[PDB]
From a paper:
We expressed, purified and performed crystallisation trials with the full-length (Pla1FL) and a C-terminal truncation (Pla1Δ14) of Pla1. Both constructs readily crystallised under a variety of conditions within 2–4 days. A comparison of our crystal structures of Pla1FL and Pla1Δ14 shows that the individual domains have undergone significant movements. An alignment based on the middle domains illustrates that the N-terminal has a modest rotation of 2.95° with a 1.13 Å displacement, while the C-terminal RRM domain has a more pronounced rotation of 9.8° and 2.26 Å displacement.
The S. pombe orthologue of the human PAXT connection, Mtl1-Red1 Core (MTREC), is an eleven-subunit complex that targets cryptic unstable transcripts (CUTs) to the nuclear RNA exosome for degradation. It encompasses the canonical poly(A) polymerase Pla1, responsible for polyadenylation of nascent RNA transcripts as part of the cleavage and polyadenylation factor (CPF/CPSF). We report crystal structures of Pla1 in its apo form and in complex with Red1. Taken together, our data reveal the molecular details of recruitment of Pla1 by Red1 which leads to hyperadenylation of CUTs, serving as a signal for exosome-mediated target degradation.
Author numbering: 13 to 450, 475 to 495, 500 to 548
Amino acid sequence: KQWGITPPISTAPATEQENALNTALINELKNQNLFESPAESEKRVKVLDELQQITTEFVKKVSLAKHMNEKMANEAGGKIFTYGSYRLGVYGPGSDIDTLVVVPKHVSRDNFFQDLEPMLREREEVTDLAAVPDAYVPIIKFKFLGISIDLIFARLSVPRVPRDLELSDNNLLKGVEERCVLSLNGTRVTDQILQLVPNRAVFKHALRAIKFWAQRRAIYANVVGFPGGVAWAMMVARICQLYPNAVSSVIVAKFFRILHQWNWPQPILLKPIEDGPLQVRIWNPKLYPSDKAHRMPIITPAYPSMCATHNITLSTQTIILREMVRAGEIADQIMVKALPWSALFQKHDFFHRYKHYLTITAAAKTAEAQLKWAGLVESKLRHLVTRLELVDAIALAHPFNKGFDKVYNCSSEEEAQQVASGVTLEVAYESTDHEKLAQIFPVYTTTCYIGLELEKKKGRLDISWPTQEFYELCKKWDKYDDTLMNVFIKNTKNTALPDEVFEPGEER
């Protein structure tokens, strides 16, 4: 069989040395503690079975509440799906479970918040329940027995959602709101990624390596213009198709070279782009100028096909390709036993590569608002880098979204507003992390960075208006409380970088 839309590059089996290196790669992954215990694996299956049970109870309640007869409420059904990194089977310890609840026609999005959310708060196993009703996609986040869940809603047009319902039928997209079809896409894409690889076990191991490399190099974030988890998976899936009989160590070594030499902006396709019954746009750079603008397009296989990497800016494209060339050189040294596998997962050098950094800090006086506020500021970083690209002096803006959390203990309430406004003065602070509590004057800050690459002379660095534009966008937030939340930007030279961004064994 031929996998993918292109004849393979090689169908040779794994050699003797590539099997030994494949074992040493899998061992390196275990040594980094990237696998959870089989206990917590069973625990996630237990939580999904509970949620599936709550789903049947939730749909039956809404059915009976709308005066449907008892027989049809039992037939009403409802099914829990999973997508993202859990459905792929490559997730770290403590990672979330992207979950989809699919309901029949008579179950409204109001029932998702006014009936299902009261059901989850009623249960003892659920903590940290936080529903955002004013989001573009309806989502409810909560911990079930300590396992973080992200639950999105999706109403169909079928009178009943049976338990054996597969989402492969494109006709099930008929008559559902264009909100709800994108929520179906998360599962339909993930199900198809597993169907299109020739070897699922080789794919999962290869993805776990590539994912860990991207996270260690801090190029694993679609919020700031890098490929997201779905994007990296479709990339690793493409190489599996091109080497259908290879082991994981081969897939990884060929992954970096094939992708930085790829003829961009030619898209990465796992299968031919489908047609469908809906009258909605499919990704076509020949028809839509916005699709034409995508620089490194990775196209999802589920109809309707879209570009998972539309956020990729000019800077972030340059950085993805730089990192692939770097990792390609390390991998080829690993495959000739010149280097161990641990070298491939050497952490980023973001705080050593530039002479000019931007410090972006979101501050709030209370820890509850700092969680919401620091997430708003992070979502506007991708616009700052694209705005900084429009500066003549700036050739590249490197976004670093691993926030650094501090808590400043000030004496006067005026000093609280003074440090929240950017005047650090000489106040004592302590480092913390995003695990919160739910004359003490607290100020909680989250610090991101943007590394600047200046243009070189052929034949003056003023970011005042991009900085001020950034403040207005953060403060246009519908939940911006001018009493608690603040945000400021500082020009930071490499020598003035704080000790927080360096580990004990690093230089400055």
